[PDB]
Amino acid sequence: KLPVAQYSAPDGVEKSFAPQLTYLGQLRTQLTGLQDDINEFLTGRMELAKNADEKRIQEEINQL
Amino acid sequence: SLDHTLELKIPFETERQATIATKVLSPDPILKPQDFQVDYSSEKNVMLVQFRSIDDRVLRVGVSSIIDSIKTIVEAMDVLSHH
């Protein structure tokens, strides 16, 4: 068994992650594997969410 | 609500290792408790870390930093385990 992660989001999305040298040595790398995975995956979600200024416009006028 | 959720299950060689890692972990996040929460623990040899967050950006920042601590420990148990 390896390290694993499992993700849930309020918009119906569910995500599962899963990727000489020593056992724990290997474990450490698999974790950068996962850390990466997760960091890609979440930025990608943040990006899609992006893709406000007007809202920041209506306030001003309100006050003018 | 803290509904962006991620659990990370990490396997060590044995329960002791797992147990000690959770003691050593002692997190302390830069993130507001209202926006971000983490729960660690261990069952047998697996370490359970459970994150809860406002949204994906908070989550991302908090999870990476933790993973970093964890690695540090895995690195340290590596050198000790072998002498």
UniProtKB/Swiss-Prot annotation, chain A:
Domain of life, per UniProt, equals Eukaryota
Coiled-coil ranges per UniProt: none
GO molecular function, a single term: chromatin DNA binding
Any one biological process term the GO annotation gives: positive regulation of transcription by RNA polymerase II
What do we know about what induces or represses this protein's expression?
Answer: Accumulates in response to hyperosmostic conditions.
Q: Would I find Nucleotide-binding among this entry's keywords?
A: no
Where's it mainly located? nucleus
Q: Which GO terms describe its cellular component?
A: chromatin; chromosome, telomeric region; EKC/KEOPS complex; nucleus
Work out whether the entry's keyword set contains Transport: no
Keywords assigned by UniProt? Activator, Chromosome, Nucleus, Telomere, Transcription, Transcription regulation, tRNA processing
Q: Where in the cell is it found?
A: Nucleus; Chromosome, Telomere
Task: State the family named in the UniProt similarity comment for this chain.
Answer: Belongs to the GON7 family.
Other information: Present with 2180 molecules/cell in log phase SD medium.
As for what it does, the entry says:
Component of the EKC/KEOPS complex that is required for the formation of a threonylcarbamoyl group on adenosine at position 37 (t(6)A37) in tRNAs that read codons beginning with adenine. The complex is probably involved in the transfer of the threonylcarbamoyl moiety of threonylcarbamoyl-AMP (TC-AMP) to the N6 group of A37. GON7 likely plays a supporting role to the catalytic subunit KAE1 in the complex. The EKC/KEOPS complex also promotes both telomere uncapping and telomere elongation. The complex is required for efficient recruitment of transcriptional coactivators.
Tell me the subunit arrangement.
Component of the EKC/KEOPS complex composed of at least BUD32, CGI121, GON7, KAE1 and PCC1; the whole complex dimerizes.
Protein's UniProt name: EKC/KEOPS complex subunit GON7
UniProtKB/Swiss-Prot annotation, chain B:
Report if keyword Transcription is assigned: yes
Q: Name the UniProt key words of this record, in alphabetical order.
A: Activator, Chromosome, Nucleus, Telomere, Transcription, Transcription regulation, tRNA processing
Q: Which GO terms describe its molecular function?
A: chromatin DNA binding
Any Pfam family hit = Pcc1
Q: rRNA-binding among the record's keywords?
A: no
**Where is this protein primarily located?**
nucleus
Cellular component per GO? chromatin; chromosome, telomeric region; EKC/KEOPS complex; nucleoplasm
Where does the UniProt annotation locate this protein?
Nucleus; Chromosome, Telomere
- Quick one: a GO biological-process term for this protein? tRNA threonylcarbamoyladenosine modification
- What biological function has been recorded for the protein in this entry? Component of the EKC/KEOPS complex that is required for the formation of a threonylcarbamoyl group on adenosine at position 37 (t(6)A37) in tRNAs that read codons beginning with adenine. The complex is probably involved in the transfer of the threonylcarbamoyl moiety of threonylcarbamoyl-AMP (TC-AMP) to the N6 group of A37. PCC1 functions as a dimerization module for the complex. The EKC/KEOPS complex also promotes both telomere uncapping and telomere elongation. The complex is required for efficient recruitment of transcriptional coactivators.
The annotated subunit structure for this chain is: Component of the EKC/KEOPS complex composed of at least BUD32, CGI121, GON7, KAE1 and PCC1; the whole complex dimerizes.
Protein family: Belongs to the CTAG/PCC1 family.
Protein name as catalogued: EKC/KEOPS complex subunit PCC1
Which organism is this entry from?
Saccharomyces cerevisiae (strain ATCC 204508 / S288c) (Baker's yeast)
Gene that encodes it: PCC1
